């Protein structure tokens, strides 16, 4: 009988991550972009939805 | 044995058939960018 496909993405027991960094890579622990001259050298507020 | 030299079949290894500079790039950048799997090291 004609059928329409569905797709879930179940992924549990883990946390999402978004490395604050230039190329999203873990090349260190004190990120290359958390040390820059526009974030660690300037105030900044943020809002995320 | 010039044929098995410039295809790196049985000859010099990677560390010394690269430039004195590209080995530096490939040994400094190996945590985020890996220029180590491209080249052939013969045995």
């Amino acid at each position: 009988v004609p059928s329409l496909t569905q797709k879930k993405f179940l992924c549990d027991r883990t946390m999402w991550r978004i490395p604050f960094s230039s190329n999203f890579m873990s090349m260190g622990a004190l990120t290359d972009l958390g040390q820059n001259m526009l974030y660690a050298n300037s105030a900044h507020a943020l809002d995320m939805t | 044995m010039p044929q098995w030299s410039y295809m790196h079949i049985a000859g010099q290894d990677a560390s010394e058939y690269l430039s004195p500079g590209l080995v530096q790039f490939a040994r400094a950048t190996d945590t985020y960018f890996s220029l180590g799997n491209k080249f052939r090291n013969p045995t």
């Binding site: - | 790039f25 400094a28 950048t29 945590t31």
Partner: peptide, 6 residues
């Protein structure tokens, strides 16, 4: 050069 971290 100059990069890696430590």
């Amino acid at each position: 050069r100059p990069f890696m971290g430590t």
